[PDB]
Amino acid sequence: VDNKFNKEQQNAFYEILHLPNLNEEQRNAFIQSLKDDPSQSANLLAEAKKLNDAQAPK
């Protein structure tokens, strides 16, 4: 994105797009959240990361 978001948000976005033990509802709320407030992306990353890892297989 050249006029939409920044790399920090798109790198985080891809990071989220790569979560294998995530769900649509979560991946959606996150992606959307990222699309809403790109500034707090790193937060949605660490959050989607903690969630994906926390909600993953034992």
UniProtKB/Swiss-Prot annotation:
Annotated Immunoglobulin-binding region B repeats reside at 1-58
Per UniProt, its applied use is:
Important immunodiagnostic reagent because of its ability to bind the Fab and Fc fragments of a wide range of mammalian immunoglobulins.
Superkingdom: Bacteria
Q: Where in the cell is it found?
A: Secreted, Cell wall
Q: Which residues form a coiled coil?
A: none
Quoted from the entry, the domain comment is:
Each of the immunoglobulin-binding region repeats can bind the Fc region of an immunoglobulin.
**According to its UniProt record, which protein family does this protein belong to?**
Belongs to the immunoglobulin-binding protein SpA family.
Under the subunit heading, UniProt states: Interacts with host TNFRSF1A; this interaction leads to the stimulation of both surface expression and shedding of TNFRSF1A.
The free-text function statement in the UniProt record for this protein reads: Plays a role in the inhibition of the host innate and adaptive immune responses. Possesses five immunoglobulin-binding domains that capture both the fragment crystallizable region (Fc region) and the Fab region (part of Ig that identifies antigen) of immunoglobulins. In turn, Staphylococcus aureus is protected from phagocytic killing via inhibition of Ig Fc region. In addition, the host elicited B-cell response is prevented due to a decrease of antibody-secreting cell proliferation that enter the bone marrow, thereby decreasing long-term antibody production.
State what protein this is by name.
Immunoglobulin G-binding protein A
Source gene? Answer: spa
